[PDB]
Each structure stands twice: as C-alpha cells, then as structure tokens.
Structure 1
Amino acid sequence: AMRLPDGTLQVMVEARARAQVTDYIPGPYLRARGEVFSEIFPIDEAVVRVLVEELKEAFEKYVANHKSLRLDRYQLEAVKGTSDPAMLADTIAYHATWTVAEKQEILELTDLEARLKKVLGLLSRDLERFELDKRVAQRVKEQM
C-alpha cells in the first residue's frame, strides 16, 4: 500500500479466490456482500496438471500466433517454475485477450475443470478467427 493522494489509487491486489455476490446495497458507494473462497477444486491433480499443460499448449498456440491481437512474448517466464494448476490456468486465461464479459463468464463457473476447456475453446476461436481472415482474404483477392 503506497500513499499518493491525488484522486487515483491503483490498489495492488492479488486475489485469493472468487466469491458470489449474495446481495448488493445501492449507494453510492455500492456495497455488495461476498461469499466464501471458492475452495471447490478437483482432486485428480495429475490429470488437472495434464489439462494445464494442454492449456499451456493452447497458450503457445495463442501467443506465438496472435501478435496481431497484441500479446506479450515475455509471459513464458511466469509459466515455468510454479506448481499451481489453478493459478497457471487463470494466468493463461488472463494473459489471453478478449472482452470483459468472457472473463465474467469465466468468473461464473466455480468448477475449475470446465474453465480450462472454455479458455482452450476461446484460443481455438481466435485461431478460427485467423483462418477466417485467411479464407476471406483469399476470397477477396480472387474476386478482385
């Protein structure tokens, strides 16, 4: 916590786990209560690490290809040397670029295993968007 009073305070937050808004109080400012930490997690941790490696394979298919989507090439330093599957999975989910509503959709599901399949689907959707761009590009050049 730094102290720079000027009207803007970027809080350095490292979130523990997600929670459900049970109720919100109209303000301003709006007070919304939270639930417990989402400690529900899979117990098949070897196969969850296998799925984390699959999400890392999708992440390597994403960063090395979607430079027109303006990703970061230095993200490979933080994905090696850690033994946390959920942290690495949502790190891949937040290093990836899409709308805020899809991050809200990720925040909806407290099931950890379906989240990686949704993120892999979104990265393959962006690969689908590139091959859509290639298809429409060859179509427009042949038509002209």
Structure 2
Amino acid sequence: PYLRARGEVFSEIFPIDEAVVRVLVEELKEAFEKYVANHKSLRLDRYQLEAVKGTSDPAMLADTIAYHATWTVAEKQEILELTDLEARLKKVLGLLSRD
C-alpha cells in the first residue's frame, strides 16, 4: 500500500437491441419500484437512479439498481465483470425477485 494500477480505458457494454433491453429495464424498474415501496428494510429513493439520465446505458442503470439493494457485494463485483447487458438486468431482477 498504497495500491496503484495501470488501468485501462472505459470498458463498457453498449446499449444493443434496444427493444428487449428497454423492456427488461422496465421490468427491472418495476421490480425495483416494488422493492422500494415494499421492502421497508431499505426505503431508498430514486435519487441515485433517476438522478442520472444523460447516460441512459442500461448497464449503468443495472449497476445502479443493484447498488440500491443490499444483497452481497460480491455479486455486484461479478455483475461489474459481466459482458452481457441483460444478464446484468436479469441478475438484478432475479435478486430483486428473491428479495
């Protein structure tokens, strides 16, 4: 320590196949909104998800909604390493359904 690394450029996944992706983001936002309005244990508002709108990349929202819930952060690391846009969305929606 202190740790340093010669990291790389922004490695993102592009919003591809907007139809199914927006559909699954809507389903994820439905599951997340009932997560917020049902799980009294968290009560986290859409002030870090709806606060970001210029970068409407569904990976950004998939990582934001996953952040808003309190399952294990190891799965957040794995979803940060995921390369599939909706497998991120399916992973967050599945963990929200489990919650």
User: TM-score, structure 1 length as denominator?
Assistant: 0.55
Deviation at 1:116, TM superposition (A): 0.6
Identity between Structure 1 and Structure 2 (%): 100
Where do 5+ consecutive residues of structure 1 fail to align?
1-27, 127-144
Greater relative contact order: 1 or 2 (C-alpha under 8 angstroms, separation 6 or more)?
2
Superposed CA offset, 1:4-28 (max 9, x none): xxxxxxxxxxxxxxxxxxxxxxxx2
Larger radius of gyration: 1
Do the aligned partners of residues 75 and 63 (structure 1) sit closer, same or farther apart at CA in structure 2, a change above 3 Å counting?
Answer: farther
Deviation at 1:78, TM superposition (A): 3.4
Asked if structure 1 preserves the Cα contact closer than 8 Å seen for 2:62 and 2:89, the reply is yes
Report 1:1-144 matches (<5 A). 28-72=1-45, 77-78=50-51, 83-126=56-99
Asked if structure 1 preserves the Cα contact closer than 8 Å seen for 2:37 and 2:43, the reply is no
Aligned-residue CA RMSD (Å): 2.7
CA distance in 1 between counterparts of 2:44 and 2:6 reads 35
Do the aligned partners of residues 117 and 63 (structure 1) sit closer, same or farther apart at CA in structure 2, a change above 3 Å counting?
Answer: same
Bigger Cα displacement from structure 2, 95-104 vs 47-56: 95-104
Deviation at 1:30, TM superposition (A): 1.9
Asked if structure 2 preserves the Cα contact closer than 8 Å seen for 1:71 and 1:97, the reply is no
Instruction: Give the number of equivalent residue pairs.
Output: 99
Do the aligned partners of residues 79 and 63 (structure 1) sit closer, same or farther apart at CA in structure 2, a change above 3 Å counting?
Answer: farther
Deviation at 1:68, TM superposition (A): 2.1
CA distance in 2 between counterparts of 1:35 and 1:79 reads 24
User: TM-score, structure 2 length as denominator?
Assistant: 0.75
Asked if structure 2 preserves the Cα contact closer than 8 Å seen for 1:41 and 1:111, the reply is no
CA distance in 1 between counterparts of 2:71 and 2:47 reads 19
CA distance in 2 between counterparts of 1:40 and 1:80 reads 17
CA distance in 1 between counterparts of 2:11 and 2:46 reads 31
Deviation at 1:105, TM superposition (A): 1.8
Deviation at 1:29, TM superposition (A): 1.5
